[PDB]
Amino acid sequence: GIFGAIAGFIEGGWTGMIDGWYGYHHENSQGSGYAADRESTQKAIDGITNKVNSIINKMNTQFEAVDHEFSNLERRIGNLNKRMEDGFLDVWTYNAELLVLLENERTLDLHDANVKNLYEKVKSQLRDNANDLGNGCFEFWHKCDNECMESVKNGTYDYPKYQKESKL
Amino acid sequence: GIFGAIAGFIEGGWTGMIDGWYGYHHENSQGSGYAADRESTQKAIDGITNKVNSIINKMNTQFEAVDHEFSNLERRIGNLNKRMEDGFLDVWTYNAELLVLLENERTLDLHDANVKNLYEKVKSQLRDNANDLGNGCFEFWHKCDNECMESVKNGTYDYPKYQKESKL
Amino acid sequence: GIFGAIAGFIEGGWTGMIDGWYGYHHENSQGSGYAADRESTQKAIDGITNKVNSIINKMNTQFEAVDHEFSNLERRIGNLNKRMEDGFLDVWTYNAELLVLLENERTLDLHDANVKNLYEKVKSQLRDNANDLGNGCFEFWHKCDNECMESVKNGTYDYPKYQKESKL
Amino acid sequence: SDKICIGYHANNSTTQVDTLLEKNVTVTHSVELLENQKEKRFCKIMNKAPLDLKDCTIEGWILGNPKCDLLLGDQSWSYIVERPNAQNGICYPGVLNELEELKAFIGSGERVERFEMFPKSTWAGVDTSRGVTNACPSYTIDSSFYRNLVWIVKTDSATYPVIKGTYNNTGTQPILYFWGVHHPLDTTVQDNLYGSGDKYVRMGTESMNFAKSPEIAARPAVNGQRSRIDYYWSVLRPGETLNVESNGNLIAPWYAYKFVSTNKKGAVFKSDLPIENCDATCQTITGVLRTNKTFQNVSPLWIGECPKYVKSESLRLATGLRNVP
Amino acid sequence: SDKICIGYHANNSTTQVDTLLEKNVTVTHSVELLENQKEKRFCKIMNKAPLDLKDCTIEGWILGNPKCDLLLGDQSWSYIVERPNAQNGICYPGVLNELEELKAFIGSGERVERFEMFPKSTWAGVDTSRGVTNACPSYTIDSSFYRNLVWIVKTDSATYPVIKGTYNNTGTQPILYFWGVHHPLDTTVQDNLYGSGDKYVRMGTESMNFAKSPEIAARPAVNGQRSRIDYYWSVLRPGETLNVESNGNLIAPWYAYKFVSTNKKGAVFKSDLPIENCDATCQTITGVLRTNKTFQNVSPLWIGECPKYVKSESLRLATGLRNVP
Amino acid sequence: SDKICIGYHANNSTTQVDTLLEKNVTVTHSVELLENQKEKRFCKIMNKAPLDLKDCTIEGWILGNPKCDLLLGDQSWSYIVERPNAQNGICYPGVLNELEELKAFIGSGERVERFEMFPKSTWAGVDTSRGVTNACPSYTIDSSFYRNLVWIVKTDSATYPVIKGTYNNTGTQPILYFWGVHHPLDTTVQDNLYGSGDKYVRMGTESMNFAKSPEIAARPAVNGQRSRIDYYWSVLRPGETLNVESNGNLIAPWYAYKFVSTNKKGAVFKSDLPIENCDATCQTITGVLRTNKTFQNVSPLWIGECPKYVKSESLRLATGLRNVP
Ligand SMILES: *C1O[C@H](CO)[C@@H](O)[C@H](O)[C@H]1NC(C)=O
Ligand SMILES: *[C@@H]1O[C@H](CO)[C@@H](O)[C@H](O)[C@H]1NC(C)=O
Ligand SMILES: *[C@@H]1O[C@H](CO)[C@@H](O)[C@H](O)[C@H]1NC(C)=O
Ligand SMILES: *[C@@H]1O[C@H](CO)[C@@H](O)[C@H](O)[C@H]1NC(C)=O
Ligand SMILES: *[C@@H]1O[C@H](CO)[C@@H](O)[C@H](O)[C@H]1NC(C)=O
Ligand SMILES: *[C@@H]1O[C@H](CO)[C@@H](O)[C@H](O)[C@H]1NC(C)=O
Ligand SMILES: *[C@@H]1O[C@H](CO)[C@@H](O)[C@H](O)[C@H]1NC(C)=O
Ligand SMILES: *[C@H]1O[C@H](CO)[C@@H](O)[C@H](O)[C@H]1NC(C)=O
Ligand SMILES: *[C@H]1O[C@H](CO)[C@@H](O)[C@H](O)[C@H]1NC(C)=O
């Protein structure tokens, strides 16, 4: 998907994660479940919202056709008016249609990037204390209780504290 | 090149790889050569094709200038017509020229991203059983026959099976 | 910031680095400082300069309104002229305003990518001979003199040469 | 073994968008920017109702065709609705000069007050009481004439003398008014109605002058008539005066309209849609749009504040991610 | 050591593209979207040939200038080509009224059938057999006249009486027709040709009326003549009738054209390019384009299905990747 | 422990930009593309000064209103400035035909040479030395007339005979010239000035004809006058000749202008701004722009080389990166 994560070396999304756009699935002895990363979710919501509103705002003018009549001795100005009106119509149709195609492409890339960046921040904490697996999951070489999980998510993991158990 | 691969920590392309846009060069005791990754190549072809066709499709209208004459008492409407025609001509010229500059930039990024994502898929399978080298190549710390090579390419490698020899 | 580096797993920029846009802070026994990577800086300058000049060049035409008068029997062509002029004005205002928003977004991504790619080039050389830390810094597990620093920056590091001080 | 994964939201959405690289991508959230729904009626705008011309065209209404009496008098409107099959316009054959500019002038207005500009007593020594024709019936009388004009003929026992009228616009509003010049089919009819001699119609203002003479000829019959009238209109600005002078062939102004030009864009909609008692902020030729959206594909013709018109079927912007459940 | 590497294609391409960040980037594959080549000729379109007016202007053709006889009769055309130095137009000096609208009307057509609208016998008690002039030679006679008009003069021994003609358009096609009013240089010529008295030309339809009188004056000589003719044109719609009435100065309609308006776009090209026997789908004023491309920088004026016109020199889109061999 | 870090530039910039995703992003470097500053004055362009009409309108200047004598003669200009409350235009009431096309024609010029086209001696057997009126004072005399026209009347002791004038344009420059037709308030004034009989004004060129007769009527008083003049203008092309012919009611051309058309764009600015002694390359209706920028929000009306007009307040493009110090 450009950053390579969404559909994906992370093949498939999670219907079970309902509280945000990106985040984490964990499983340990104390149970399993989904939790959204709220900081990167909200930041993306603000970004996309701002995008939508900027497009709306910048497309907030209208060309206005008129329905003036023209006699049979005004074929040239009548046709000039027709060509001008269809002129602006075709310009605005193109601008709207293309903008949507382009922004849609980029909006999917942005989501892809955000997933990828989560993945990389976790990878950087865990090192060899977990095995990658290359599908977005990390099998720990040690035992990771719930505040060990919460530790990974909040960006405070303490590699050394489990470095020993992981070697063995 | 934005994702950093094309020209490049992967300095240089391969004239020897003729069957696709991205892929693999292998060398082992049983020989050497180039093979394209078909799935990412095709997916990119479909993407780029669709982009090209969408641009063509959305540019599939024409503003039409007209041959009409104006008398010496119609300088104002004659000039209005001239300014209108040149008006749309300049709008469409700008749209076409800029779209091409912008899409060309993004198309080169896309290719860069796809190469990068191949690289990262291979890296994730091989681990410390091959030495990176940081130029797109992986020197195996064990011996990799042709179906071991096929294995890497089709996304089925078996890390543990060679963890052995990679030891020394 | 999309590539995730600028503001940032690299939270914060360097007022101390005055000679370019991207680069390195080193500290060792022989001293410390900030040094721009000149190749990636210059390449980005050229890219951005070319972008700016291409926009300027492609916007180098004008629609020209006219001060002609219309009698009280020319309400229809007078209004046609008014709508046409305002028509192009609204088209060019949209094109300029949106192009700026879109390019600004992309220009920031470009800078973000270039920082990220510097980070990844370094990471790929150093491996386990340094500890990441995940904030753009690498603590060496060995002793890195000035020629060793220069070595990292110019892309010639020699992992094996220090592989085994890094052991311990 | 303990595990932590990175991933992304999926849901039950089947809604799709297109991108440059790919068509029909199902996404988790999206927003449609285009309106394609309308109420097929006409409503009030800025709380003013539209004017329904019913079975009259603009020409019939404004000249006072006798079959258009239900429109007679003062009117206020937010826009005008003219029905495509309207039958009552110009009944006595001829051309309304600068017709398209007249239509455009009236469409830029919001109110008219009808008033008597030249009472029949203005014109001395002529007959102001026939001037009635079968080309131009009422619903109740088979032979009549426009309610805003007077077809003057000579009295039976005298010549048609020079006649004169004057009207000083002392108000603050411009006055829209009408006149005509009768062009008989032959010399016999010219002589019956106006007597012999070179006839003229002259009209004048501080800023306009008009002069015309009859052009006698037998033209193809229309509503029974081989004669014609040339109809005319003008606008008497505040502080201006109009002098009328004729010795024959004058279709004289009688009633005219104090005219108030509107504050914004006016419209004349040619449509069969019904008018109802409803308010609106956006009224197109083919219906009302009640929408917050930024685009619409309903119609390029409207008044009020409408979304921009485009030819698209849909303009759906992705907000969420590719849906991979 | 056994080795696997990831990489990308390169090839022998030297073709370059530009991007916002960088000019002259060599890429492995690309597609040019703009056409800049044209065959400098005129070809058939929808396999119907263009009409070549050769040494005639539109005026000369349609009025029937005697030197334009090779065009005389029915014509069918995909477009019209008028040569910039064409010498045969209006031979007897004067103005063709509403000329630009005439040119626009004709350019919206595809066929004319020429036919006799008023035979010379229509006009009783006048001479229809002189009306010939040295301003307007044929290739075979020095003194002639337009083939679609009749210059009527009085007989030697009588007054010019009132003359009348009528034509009922019973067909399904509109009729394009012409007339004139002669304006002599002085009273002597007026009296020689039409006799004394106030002269008039009146023409009438259910929807148009025309009235004019001679305007006598000596103007600068053009093709030997200090007199003038005012030429006119109109369109008699299906189901309409035309009445003509004059007692002098009438250049009468004689032949006219049943006119078929295209439901395509029509064109009149002013150009010196040659017409050849070739087919085309896209014909510009400066030549044919044979192309599947979506843009072109050849000309904004065309008929058929052409690419969009832009001022660019090249619009090359990258499809492949940066070429680094 | 030894350390190497990757990082990026920051600085003291507080300058912000907007992006699609985020407003008010402070960046290290940026460039503003839009100009919003103007010198509120008029300057020379291509080192030619503008023509200041001061207390005259275009009409007063070009017809020669006696109160516009400070403009009289040759003029060269880069553009024209007409002041909104200019008081001296048409002094003797009436309409200048095709006024808007006249204004456009003049705006497309850069120079005029005034010259005597028909000396008063052209017109035999008439009085060329009254033709003076209180509607049209000089600064010096209460009763005068346009300096480029001659109001001809009959001599006291004779009828107004046919008069004739001719002018052959043997130069390389087109000539802009004026005439009129007097329309008296009544038959008494017609007879006093021109005597009895059907009067006419005829003008003719190889390519234009004009014919008009007086239209007598009493119109509302303007500058004391219930009579009118219809004023006209035309352009005598190089190699063309003009014949004038009248037996009454002619306001004759006297002085005219050799006219040189610019092959730039010309302009007529309606403004109260002062003209000063300065050069400029870009002059808008509301002031001069001194700028290398590519956009501006000052005015859509200009001459010279100006940036593209847009409605934006600012168009700031990021060049550097997000500033995080
Ligand atoms: C690219 O630059 C070359 C010179 O290096 C120039 O001749 C050529 O015209 C340029 N290409 C395009 C597509 O403009
Ligand atoms: C889809 O999901 C929503 C909640 O997210 C639920 O309310 C709705 O019923 C679902 N649709 C179907 C068809 O089950
Ligand atoms: C480039 O390559 C193709 C096939 O790979 C070859 O046929 C073609 O001739 C080559 N072009 C040149 C200029 O050699
Ligand atoms: C023209 O012809 C048709 C039938 O041939 C007839 O109905 C119509 O009355 C005619 N009109 C005139 C004016 O002769
Ligand atoms: C900011 O630094 C610049 C040099 O880049 C210096 O010239 C300027 O005076 C400084 N301004 C402020 C407000 O610190
Ligand atoms: C105008 O002048 C030229 C000579 O300069 C002459 O040949 C031509 O006959 C003149 N035109 C008229 C109408 O006399
Ligand atoms: C119209 O009336 C006003 C005010 O009563 C007056 O000053 C003006 O002279 C009048 N004009 C005419 C022509 O009667
Ligand atoms: C996408 O394709 C579907 C069929 O899968 C088609 O019916 C639909 O109209 C398309 N949607 C859009 C938004 O173009
Ligand atoms: C950004 O917001 C600031 C408030 O800090 C405001 O003054 C300004 O309108 C915005 N910037 C621009 C360039 O408009």
Q: What would you say this structure looks like, in words?
A:
The complex is a heterohexamer, with 3 copies of chain A (168 residues) and 3 copies of chain D (325 residues). Chain A has helices spanning 38-58, 75-126, 146-153, 159-167; strands at residues 22-28, 31-36, 130-131, 137-140. The longest helix of chain A is centred in the middle third of the chain and has 52 residues, at 75-126. Chain A is mainly alpha-helical. Chain A has one domain (1-168): Alpha-Beta Complex (Hemagglutinin Ectodomain, Chain B). In chain D, strands 8, 10, 11, 13, 16, 18 and 19 form a 7-stranded antiparallel sheet that branches. Chain D has a 4-stranded antiparallel sheet with strand order 12-17-14-15, with no helix packed on it. In chain D, strands 5-24-26 form a 3-stranded parallel sheet, with no helix packed on it. Chain D contains 3 helices and 27 strands. Chain D has 2 domains: 1-42 and 277-325, Ribbon (Hemagglutinin, Chain A, domain 2), CATH 2.10.77; 43-276, Haemagglutinin, alpha/beta domain, HA1 chain (Hemagglutinin (Ha1 Chain), Chain: A, domain 1), CATH 3.90.209. In chain D, a hairpin with a 2-residue loop joins strand 22 (282-284) and strand 23 (287-288). In chain D, 7% of the residues lie in helices and 34% in strands. The D-E interface holds D 93-95, 183, 215-220, 222, 228 and E 202, 204-209, 211, 240-243, 245. Bound molecules: 2-acetamido-2-deoxy-beta-D-glucopyranose (9 copies). One 2-acetamido-2-deoxy-beta-D-glucopyranose (NAG) binds at residues 168, 170, 241 of chain F.
